[PDB]
Each structure stands twice: as C-alpha cells, then as structure tokens.
Design a protein around this ligand. Structure first.
Ligand code: SF4
Ligand code: F3S
Lengths: 284, 58, 457, 402
C-alpha cells in the first residue's frame, strides 16, 4: 500500500480555511538566480563575511543546489549502485561515486523549509517555540526560542539557520546593519534577531496577513492570482517556476498543478507530509 | 502511599496543560484525549512517583 | 555457625573494632602533606581556567565553538552523556549489590557514592552552558505567569531529561547522606578541637545509636535501594531517548535504552577501579580494599563488556538485514570515512580490553587492571563521540554533507570539568569518613583472616 | 528418593489424549479467497508452533537460571538444584518435536513462513518478491535448518553433562567435578547469549520477512525467562506440600517470589520501550507491525500488558504475602498465562491475521503439551534423589533464612 496511508496517529482538519502549498517544476529552473536576493530583502537576513562562511556557518533561508554525475548520465549513477556485491566492492564504488567524471549532466534544485505536517522539528522543542497553524505553516516564534539546538538536527532536509554572534551593531560586522545611514533598507514589519534564536524560511506571513486584511475590510473574497503576487519567493522569479497560492480554492494556479501526473514530494518514505512538491525533470 | 500521591500529581498536571488548556499541535501528535498521546507522558509520570515515594519517607 | 570454607577473608590483618575505626578515622584526624597540596593546586588551576572559558563563550557567543550549521551537537552533549555514564557506578554499588546481598561491597560503597555526587554535578553544567540564551533557562519550568499562563509541552525528551537528572541527583544525595550519620557520630566523639567538635556536632544529627534507630535505619536503606535501581535504569534511558526517538539514520533505533545503560555500567566501574587502586596505597587502607575486591570489579567489567559486544553485532546484522540504503550507508561511513580513526580506535578498546579478564594471570594483577581500567574510559568517550558526529555530517541530501573540528574553547571547558571533579573529590578524601564503620563492624566477625582460621581449627 | 504419585500418570495421559484428539480435529476443518483460504489453512498449524516454542523456551528459561546460580556461587540454591534438573528433562524431548515441525515447513506441508514458499526468489514468477529475495543470503533454507539444528545441540549437550558431572561429584572424596561444571556453565552462558540473539531472528522474526527491529531478542529472552522462574517455584511448592522436600522454607519461597517479581517488571520495561520508540516517530516503514496488531488484536495486545505487569505489581510487593503459598501460586499462574499470550500475540497476526480465535485447535495444543511436560518432569524426578550430597555450599543453604 502507498506509504502515506500508514499512520498510528490521527490527523487534524485543514479542509476549510486556506490550506497553502508551493510548487516547483524542475524544467523551468534555469538558475533561479534572482529568487534568492528577493527573499533576503524583507526578511532582514544579515551579511556574513568571508570567514564565518569559510567555516560553512552562513545564513540563507533558501538555497539552490548543484549535482554533477559520474559517467556522463544520471542513469549511469544508478546502474553502478543497483549492481553491487558484498562488502568488498561496496567500499570502492561509493568512494568513486564522489569524483565527477568528464562532461557530466548538471541539475538544479531549489530547497527551502517545506512546512511539514508530521514535522520532526516540532515535537522536541522543550520551550515550545514552534507550532502549526490551520493554514498549514510552521510558525516560528522568536521569543521562547532559548537556543537548545535540537530542531536543526531532526530536520532531514536540514534547512534551519541558527545565529551565532550578534550581527546587528558590533564592529566585527561593519556591513550595512551597523552604520546609521544604511539602516533604511530594513522594513519595520519584520523584527531583527539578536542572539541565540533560530530562523527559518517561513511562508510569506507578513504579506498574506495583509492580503486577508485588504480583502476583509472591503467585503470581498480573495481573488485567483492575489496570493501569488504578494509572496516575493514566487512574485519575483523570472520564469514561471515558483507558484504560490491557495488549494481549497479550486480555481487557483496551485490547485491545477497539484492534480498532475508529476505530483512528487521529497522523501515520502520518511513520512513527514511536506507542503512543497516538485515535479520531474523531463529532459530528452 | 507517597508514590500514589506522586502519580496523581503527574497525571493531573499533564492532562490539564496539554489537552484541557491549550490543545495545540506540536508535530502530528494527537492531543484530542489523554489516551491519545499517552506514551509521551510516561517518562515523567514514572519519575514523579519515585521522587515523592523517596523523599517523603526519608 | 554455617559459613562455607570455600570463601576467602575480606578483612586482612586480624583487626578488631578499634583497629578498624582508628585506621579509617586517622586520615580525617590529621594534616595533609606537601604532595596533596601540589595535586590540589594543579586541579584548582585547571578549574579556574575552565571557568574563564565558560564565561567567555557565554558572554560572546556559541559561534566561538567549533559547531556547524549541520552539526548542532558535538563535545557539549558528548561530554554531558559521558559524565552521566560515570555517575551511575555508585548507585549500582550501593543499591544493586545490596539487593543481591554482596558482602564485599561494604568496603567500596562510601567512595562509590562520592563518585556520583561529584560527576552528576559536572554533567549538570552542559545543559546550561550550550544554551543560546541561558539567562532565560527558568522558562523550562511550568510556572504560572503573566503570559496568559503560558506553559511548556510535555513531549520532548529534553524536558524529560530535566526531570530525570534533577530527581536522580536529589534522591541520591539524601541516600548517601543518611548513611553518614553513624560515621559522623564517631568523629564528633573525638572532638580534638572545639572547632571540629562544633563541626561534627552539626554535620551529624542527634544520632545516638539505639535499637529502634538502627531498626528504622535498615528499613529505610532497603526501601531506597529498591527505588534506586529503577532510577539507575530510567534516568539513563531518558538520556538515551534523545537519539533513539529521532528520524536521523544511524540514530533511530530501539537498542539504545538497554545498550547505553550497559555501557554506563562498564565505563563507571572502570573509573571507580582506578581510584580504588591509588586510594588503597595513599590512605593505607589496603587491608580493606583487597585483591578480591579488585578481581570482582574486573569480572563485572568483563561481563558488561561482552554485553556491549553483542549489541555491536546486533546493529550490524540488522543494518545488513534491513533494505534501507540510508542506514547501510551510515554504517559504511563509520567503517570507512574521514572519522574512521575514531570508529576503529573505539572498537579496538571496547572489543579487546574486557577480554583480557578471562586470563587469571591478567585479571589478578593490580598493575594490568589499572592500565586497562584507564583505557576503557578512552574508548567510551569515543563511543559517545562517534555516534553523534558520524551520524550528522552525513545524511539525507548530499548537498548538506560536511565535516567537524573542535576549537580550544570546546576542549578547555571539558578540561575545566575534569579539574573541578578532582578538586571536589580530593577535598572529600580529607574531611569525610571514607569507609562506613556501621557497615564494616557487622562483617568483621563473619569474615576476616582471624575468625576464619578459628573456624578451621 | 521421590515416590511417584500414581495419579499424575493417568492425569497426564488424559491430557495427552484429549489434547491430541483435539489437534486431529483441528486439521479436519478471484484473488480475495486466495488470501483468506491461506489464513484459514494456517490456523491448526500455528496453533502447534506456538505451543512447542512456548514450552521449548520455558525449559531454556530454567537452564539459563541454573547455570547462573552455579556460576554466581549462590548460598541458597543447592537444595533446589535437583528440582531444577528434574524440570529441565523436557528440553531433550521437546526440542525433537519442535525441530520436526521446522522440517515440515521446509518440505512444504504448510504455509507457516512466507519466504519458504515457492517462486519467491525467482524473477520468472508471479510470486516473485524482490525484498525477500534480497534477504536470501540469510533466509536460504538449508542454512536456516543447519543454523537452527546446532543451537539445539548446544543446549542439550550442556544439560546432559551438567547432570552427569553432578552425580559424579556426589560419589567422590575430592572435588574436580564442581570446578568442572563451574567452567562448563561459564562457557554455556557465553554460548547461550549468542545463540539467543540468532534464535529469535530465525524462529520468531522470520514470521515477517518485511519487518525488522533492534532489541528484539532481549525482549524475547525476558518473555520466557520470567516464566521459567515461576515454573521452578510451582514445582517446589507442590513437592513440599506432598512432603518430599526438606530444608525448604518460606525464605526460599520468598527469595524466588521477589526474584520473579523484579524480572517481570524488567519485561514490562522492554515491552514499552520497543513500542514507544516506534509510536513516537512513526516513520511508516516498519510501523504496520503495530497498526495491524492494535487494530485487530486489541484486547490480546493490551491484556498482555496488564497480566504481566499490573496484576503482580499489587501482589508481590508485600513481604508477608511473598511467604504465602497461595499468593505465590496465584501469581505464578497469572504470569504463565500472560507469557503464553505474549507468544500468541507475536506469531498469530502473521499466519492467520484477522481470522484468529482461541477455540478448540488452540486449547487442544496447549493441553497436549501440558500433559507431555508434566509426564516427563515428574518421571524424571524418580530417577535421582532430591537434596544432593557433599557440595561446597549446601550446608549453608540448608540453614538459609531471610
Ligand atoms: S522541513 Fe525542516 S523546518 Fe520545515 S517543517 Fe519539516 S523539519 Fe521543520
Ligand atoms: S527546538 Fe526550540 S528553543 Fe529554539 S533551537 Fe529549536 S526552536
């Protein structure tokens, strides 16, 4: 039986009231270059120097990947592995499959915090700084987070960025966060973190709480492409790769993409129920 | 008898806070009842019964 | 009476009641020598320097440590669980050996208790020091407040750990303390100075040893020993579940709850044995700590070592048996990878050290067993290290793969806890009655190289 | 010596006839039915398997304890060793029957095991299962038989020579047999631990080739070791009440009562930790193991917790009650029933699933082996005197009190 049907627990009702998703199709991902800088524009992610990134301790909420291959194809890295012997060859094949061969194939993959439903990063927080909503986010409070760094470990995708120094006003980081003339880029609607608290690529709460707001004072229902135009993770990319919006509204752009033959999540055998689905690379 | 006091403390504490004051979701843990999500309370309930049984008789 | 002629004497030197009390009271009743002061000074300096490192990293940032965005735990919790493992030895010696009526424990129990009260305390520093905002640690407790009675959840093993450790220590403190009442009584009755007179009249309670008082005393210790064994198991198990309950390949399992416990017994006794070896020569109490006590410590270590060995092959079998590639790769990474030397040096120590004890010529040797007892602690440090690090730098999504290397402030804090351990233990040995008198005097007639010879003729 | 009752013979005969007849009765009764009919045909087969492995391991739970008591130089056990030797006479007979059953599976007379079916390994078949086929390096049938076979010799040989050397020690003017057995028992315990781990994989976890778990064998060990202790106590109570034991008193009973109590709690500990570590982080692979048990075997699954924990928890905690014959007998019965259920629960959902029931074919196999067990044990007690002769610790055990 499909792995998603096995569950010792009981689910929660998110069938009404704006269940969200987010849609990547891997064909449209050329380089996804400007999708990064627009996400670090509202969210006030600080700038780290050459050192403290040299030690692989940077601060980014979404990332683009880079996967080469050995022996010129991706199917050539699935014939060497499925044909394997016992413990004498498997110590040598897995050590040769990290050396990329000449003229391989390249593949890109945008990876952010897909807001899970059976989320492993939730249950182990002792101070209860994380929780879920009815819309289907992963709400991250910056207040109870007394930084016992568990929830960076149980994320199998491992997109969770703890901050280590104070990046705001000290002279060790003499970037735009420090000087008085250059603290005007920072928007007042999103707070600026100090020390010891984690941060995470949330869904665009500071926009979608204003889209519901501007559709409630008027007395209307939210339109078709109104959620898509506000979240700058999707409303700033060049191609039509990133698609954000509603699902319970059966006339949006997300609900026509979720019912497809390319419906596909990362790591379904883990059983975490993500809310961001990729499609398929259909190269020829 | 002191141990029996301890288990009543542990179970009335957790059954109040977790399911009758804020029944929020932390993960996919079913916080609908006290049978549901019971196993996660065992590590605490145990320790409380020993704690009271030990110190109150000393 | 009805004692078997097979058993060997536990008390050497034809010692009577006065002989025993004088021998044990003597190190308390006199001054410390120059060598004591030299060692004390060294331990103190290491401790003070360690404090400086702790203050520095708390006030400047966790980023001064060698932690990564991938590896959130290493050396902090590694040393935490290492010290916790050490602090289970005394609660076995004073409770489990009690439950199995093991007479030979009477010469160890008191120093064995010191081993837990000075090591659980060391472990208690790490849950605070590694925190991002430790001055807000009080939020861990479910205390009514102005945030609309904002509570804590009761689903995380980190919280379970708070209850496990704080009650483990609390209970063991009153247990060993109660056992001191008849021994402090024997010091207040010496009162060589009015100062010391006052001190021991306060340290002891109004313990005028009487029929009824002893009757109740015995019953209390039986109850607490009964409660203590469950605590030994459940506390280390709650610690174990910090990894067993995860979704990370290489950590998610069911073997850890008894596995880590077996390792805790193994490493704990290895530690205790080295201190007893030097203690019986410095304090001149070699007539109480005999080669039979040493041999029995070695035998127990041998037994638990083999249990650990079985668990190692259990995990490897299951990994092969399982069709999950992620679990199999994790074990391949340990066998061959950038941390191969941690894994194989760990395995070398844990596999071969306890197997030397099958040879009587090696087991019955204070020289050989001293060395081996030290080695065991090294292997066990790596046991904890390997599990945590090798399972995090390699996992789901190859793009997140990394390395790990500690900094001088990670090392320094660990050194500090070692120094502090010895400051506390060393001072203990010059102010407390190192051997229970109430216990030894109940076995002096039952066993010893005088009464047995009398029984034989 | 021990005079046989001259009544238990016919009693055990009745059990070995009525049980046997019930067993015989049990075998006389699109793609949907292809599932169902196998569930139905397996019912009288797993009804026998669970009975044999229960009593087989019951005997092993005594030998493990026996070896431990001699290695640990216990000063209260010598007076009870003859009873324990009498109990562990079942093993060299029960192990024959069990082994034969394993052979019958190999010869395709049933569908007890999945991976022993035909067409599973080969890709040229509608029965092809790649997951099982990938585990064939361990599940290969001839390896399974040989590996199982040598575990039986490794237990039976120990039993045989332990008794032989003991009797030799009884008729000697020096020692040499005591020390011989001391060395042998130490070797046995090492062997036992290794054979125990593999045994569980081959005889219990082999019912579900799509499931695995660490900490399985230690759980299994506790589930029979506890019951072994209670069977020791019950036989000594019987013999004592019939006037065949001397130098046995309530302190010996009390010591056994508190021993079995502590280890029954230990069983509960292992049970819970295995369950919770799957429930807490329910990664769907390897979770259906509990899904299909909780949803189907509801009362069996949870009733086994109560009977093996809650009941004795409020009984064998009073030290006065630990000295009472009827308290100990009562608790012993409940514990034995509870562990029978434990083995029932582990095996049944893999062979019959939701077609399970506790009717005639189940009861019949229980009574048959019950009678057999009784017959063999009490017959064995007539072949050697109770209360061994010169033994380095028997003089203190004859005056043991607590
Ligand atoms: S992806 Fe990582 S951060 Fe987002 S919910 Fe799942 S575990 Fe938590
Ligand atoms: S588990 Fe909790 S305290 Fe912060 S580090 Fe993660 S939100």
């Amino acid at each position: 039986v499909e792995a998603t049907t096995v569950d010792l627990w009981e689910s929660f009702d998110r069938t009404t009231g704006h269940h969200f998703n987010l849609s990547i199709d891997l064909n449209a991902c050329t380089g996804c270059g400007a999708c990064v800088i627009a996400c670090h524009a509202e969210n006030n992610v600080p700038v780290v120097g050459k050192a403290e990134v040299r030690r692989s301790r940077d601060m980014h909420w979404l990332r683009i990947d880079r996967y080469y291959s050995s022996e010129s194809t991706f199917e050539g890295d699935n014939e060497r592995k499925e044909g394997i012997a016992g413990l004498s060859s498997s110590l040598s094949t897995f050590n040769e499959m990290e050396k990329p061969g000449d003229n391989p194939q390249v593949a890109f993959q945008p990876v952010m915090c897909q807001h899970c439903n059976h989320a492993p990063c939730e249950t182990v927080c002792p101070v209860a700084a994380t929780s879920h909503g009815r819309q289907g986010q992963n709400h991250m409070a910056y207040n109870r987070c007394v930084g016992t760094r568990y929830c960076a470990n149980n994320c199998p995708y491992k997109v969770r960025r703890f901050n280590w120094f104070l990046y705001n006003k000290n002279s060790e980081f003499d970037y735009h966060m420090n000087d008085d003339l250059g603290r005007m880029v920072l928007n007042p609607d999103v707070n600026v973190r100090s020390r010891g608290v984690m941060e995470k690529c949330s869904f665009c709460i500071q926009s979608t709480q204003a889209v519901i707001l501007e559709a409630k004072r008027q007395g209307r229902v939210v339109g078709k492409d109104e959620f898509n135009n506000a979240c700058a993770c999707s409303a700033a990319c060049s191609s039509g790769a990133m698609v954000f919006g509603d699902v319970n509204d059966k006339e949006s752009e997300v609900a026509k993409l979720a019912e497809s033959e390319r419906m596909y999540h990362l790591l379904e055998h883990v059983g975490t129920k993500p809310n961001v689905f990729y499609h398929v690379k259909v190269r020829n | 008898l002191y141990g029996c006091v301890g288990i009543s403390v542990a179970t009335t504490m957790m059954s109040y806070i977790m399911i009758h004051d804020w029944p929020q979701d932390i993960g996919g843990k079913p916080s609908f009842s006290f049978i549901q999500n019971m196993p996660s309370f065992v590590p605490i309930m145990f320790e409380m019964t020993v704690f009271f049984a030990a110190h109150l008789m000393v | 009476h009805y004692e078997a002629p097979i058993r060997k004497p536990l008390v050497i030197g034809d010692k009577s009641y006065h002989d025993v009390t004088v021998d044990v009271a003597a190190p308390v009743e006199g001054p410390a020598n120059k060598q004591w002061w030299i060692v004390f000074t060294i331990a103190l300096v290491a401790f003070l320097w360690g404090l400086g490192c702790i203050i520095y990293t708390v006030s400047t940032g966790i980023g001064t440590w060698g932690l990564n965005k991938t590896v959130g735990w290493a050396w902090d919790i590694t040393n935490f669980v290492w010290w916790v493992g050490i602090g289970h030895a005394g609660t076995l010696i004073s409770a489990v050996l009690l439950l199995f009526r093991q007479r030979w424990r009477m010469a160890i129990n008191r120093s064995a208790e010191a081993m837990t009260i000075f090591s659980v305390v060391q472990a208690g520093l790490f849950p605070i020091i590694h925190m991002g905002r430790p001055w807000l640690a009080y939020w861990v407790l479910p205390i009514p407040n102005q945030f609309g009675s904002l509570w804590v959840n009761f689903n995380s093993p980190l919280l379970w750990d708070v209850f496990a450790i704080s009650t483990y220590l609390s209970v063991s403190l009153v247990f060993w303390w109660t056992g001191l009442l008849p021994d402090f009584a024997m010091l207040r009755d010496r009162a060589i100075t009015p100062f010391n007179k006052r001190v021991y009249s306060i340290l002891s309670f109004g313990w005028s040893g009487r029929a009824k008082d002893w009757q109740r005393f015995e019953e209390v210790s039986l109850v607490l020993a009964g409660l203590a064994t469950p605590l030994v198991l459940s506390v280390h198990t709650i610690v174990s579940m910090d990894f067993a309950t995860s979704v990370i390949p290489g950590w998610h399992t069911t073997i850890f709850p008894p596995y880590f416990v077996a390792g805790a017994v193994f490493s704990g006794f290895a530690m205790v044995n080295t201190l007893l070896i030097v203690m019986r020569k410095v304090s001149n109490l070699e007539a109480y700590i005999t080669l039979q006590h040493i041999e029995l410590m070695n035998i127990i270590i041998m037994i638990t070592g083999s249990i650990v060995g079985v668990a190692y092959i259990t995990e490897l079998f299951v990994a092969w048996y399982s069709g999950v590639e992620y679990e199999q790769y994790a074990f391949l990474n340990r066998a061959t990878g950038p941390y191969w030397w941690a894994y194989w040096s760990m395995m070398t120590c844990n596999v071969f050290s306890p197997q030397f004890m099958w040879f009587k010529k090696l087991r019955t040797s204070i020289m050989f067993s001293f060395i081996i007892s030290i080695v065991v602690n090294i292997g066990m440090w790596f046991e904890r290290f390997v599990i945590i690090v090798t399972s995090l730098h390699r996992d789901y999504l190859p793009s997140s793969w990394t390395m790990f290397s500690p900094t001088f402030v990670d090392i320094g804090i660990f050194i500090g806890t070692i120094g502090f351990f010895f400051v506390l233990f060393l001072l203990y040995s010059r102010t407390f009655p190192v051997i229970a008198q109430a216990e030894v005097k109940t076995i002096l007639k039952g066993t010893g190289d005088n009464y047995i010879r009398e029984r034989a003729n | 010596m021990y005079t046989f009752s001259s009544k238990l013979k016919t009693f055990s005969i009745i059990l070995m006839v009525l049980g046997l007849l019930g067993i015989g009765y049990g075998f006389l009764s699109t793609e949907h039915l292809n599932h169902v009919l196998h569930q139905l045909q397996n019912k009288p087969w797993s009804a026998l398997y669970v009975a044999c492995i229960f009593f087989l391991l019951l005997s092993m739970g005594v030998l493990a304890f026996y070896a431990i008591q001699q290695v640990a130089q216990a000063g209260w056990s010598p007076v009870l060793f003859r009873v324990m030797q009498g109990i562990t006479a079942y093993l060299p007979a029960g192990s024959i029957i069990f082994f034969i059953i394993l052979v019958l599976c190999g010869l395709h007379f049933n569908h007890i095991f999945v991976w022993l079916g035909e067409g599973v390994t080969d890709p040229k078949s509608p029965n092809y299962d790649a997951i099982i086929a990938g585990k064939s390096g361990y599940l290969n049938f001839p390896f399974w038989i040989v590996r199982a076979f040598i575990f039986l010799l490794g237990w039976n040989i120990y039993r045989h020579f332990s008794r032989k050397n003991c009797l030799a020690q009884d008729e000697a003017n020096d020692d040499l047999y005591y020390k011989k057995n001391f060395k042998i028992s130490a070797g046995f315990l090492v062997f036992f631990i290794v054979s125990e781990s593999i045994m569980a994989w081959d005889w219990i976890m082999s019912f579900d080739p799509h499931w695995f778990s660490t900490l399985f064998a230690w759980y299994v060990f506790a589930s029979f070791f506890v019951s072994g202790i209670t069977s020791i106590a019950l036989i000594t109570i019987y013999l004592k009440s019939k006037g065949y034991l001397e130098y046995v008193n309530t302190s010996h009973i009390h010591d056994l009562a508190k021993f079995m109590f502590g280890i029954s709690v230990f069983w509960t500990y292992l049970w819970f930790s295995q369950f919770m570590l799957i429930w807490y982080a329910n990664i769907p692979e390897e979770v259906t193991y509990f899904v299909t048990r909780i949803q189907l075997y509801n009362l069996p699954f949870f009733g086994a917790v109560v009977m093996n924990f809650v009941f004795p928890l409020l009984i064998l905690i009073n030290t006065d009650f630990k000295r009472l014959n009827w308290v100990v007998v009562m608790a012993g019965i409940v514990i034995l029933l509870g562990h029978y259920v434990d083995f029932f629960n582990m095996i049944m959902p893999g062979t019959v699933g939701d077609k399970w029931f506790i009717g005639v074919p189940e009861i019949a196999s229980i009574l048959f082996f019950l009678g057999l067990f009784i017959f063999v044990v009490f017959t064995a007690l007539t072949k050697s005197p109770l209360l061994a002769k010169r033994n380095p610790f028997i003089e203190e055990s004859k005056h043991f009190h607590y």
